[PDB]
């Protein structure tokens, strides 16, 4: 049970789960 590779670039067209408030890297769990 883990998240979809929240380090992505969040931004818009990402796809994390409850960290994607952020610029680049998800900031979720970490």
């Given at each position: 049970r883990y998240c979809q590779k929240?380090?992505?670039?969040?931004?818009?067209?990402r796809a994390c789960c409850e960290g994607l408030r952020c610029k680049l890297w998800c900031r979720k769990i970490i």
């Open positions: 929240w380090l992505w670039t969040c931004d818009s067209k």
